[PDB]
A and B are shown apart, each in its own frame.
Chain A
């Protein structure tokens, strides 16, 4: 029989899909962060102060 190379073709499709999925979620995380940037700093400050 012949060899239509299905492994490498599906591998190409996979490797092309991998980086598109991730970036939507990474932007969602970046959006969540933008609320916690005037809370985490002073919280860490007050915690280390109370600790010392």
Chain B
């Protein structure tokens, strides 16, 4: 059958794309080890994951967190936590106003038009104007 050939070639081309990984498996191949983030030494932790880059002599045990990269549609993109975040739906976060009601309905755009921040700045400004006017008054009589 040539479908086996098609899928074999597909798998070879995909694993030669340069992405997707090589994970450490078990002998039966059903136990995929957990990621090696938080370990300080490496004696006894060789099987976990990117543990390759962890020593007991280098105070930087944070190299396992360098955000894998992927070529797609033209350029390299970085990934936060792939899989093996349905909380945050970025196609909804990242887009324009579609109507007037979106100033209160949208969850990001509402965080701006209701900020108590342009009102505290004016207060700090007038509060410094007052001290500087105290000074202006105490100099204007010496002269």
Q: Do chains A and B touch in the complex (CB under 8 A)?
A: yes
Contacts of B103 on A, CB cut-off 8 Å?
8
Please tell me which one of the listed residues A8, A19, A48 contacts residue B121 in the complex, with CB atoms under 8 A apart: A19
Residues of B within 8 A of A (CB): 96-100, 103, 109, 112-113, 115, 117-118, 121, 124, 128, 135, 138-139, 141-142
Chain A contact residues: helix, strand, loop or mixed = helix
By beta carbon, the residue of chain B nearest A8 is B97
Q: How many residues of A contact B (CB 8 A)?
A: 18
Q: Are A16 and B112 in contact (CB under 8 A)?
A: yes
Per-residue interface assignment for chain A, residues 1 to 38, with 1 indicating a CB less than 8 Å from any chain B CB and 0 otherwise: 00011001100100110110010001001000000000
Q: Are B98 and A5 in contact (CB under 8 A)?
A: yes
Whole-angstrom distance between the alpha carbons of A16 and B108 in the complex? 11
Q: Are B112 and A22 in contact (CB under 8 A)?
A: no
By beta carbon, the residue of chain A nearest B106 is A12
Contacts of B99 on A, CB cut-off 8 Å?
5
Contacts of A29 on B, CB cut-off 8 Å?
128
By beta carbon, the residue of chain B nearest A26 is B124
Whole-angstrom distance between the alpha carbons of A12 and B112 in the complex? 7
With A5-B97, A8-B97, A26-B124 known as contacts, the answer to whether A44 contacts B113 (CB < 8 A) is no
With A12-B112, A15-B113, A26-B124 known as contacts, the answer to whether A51 contacts B96 (CB < 8 A) is no
Contacts of A15 on B, CB cut-off 8 Å?
112-113, 115, 118
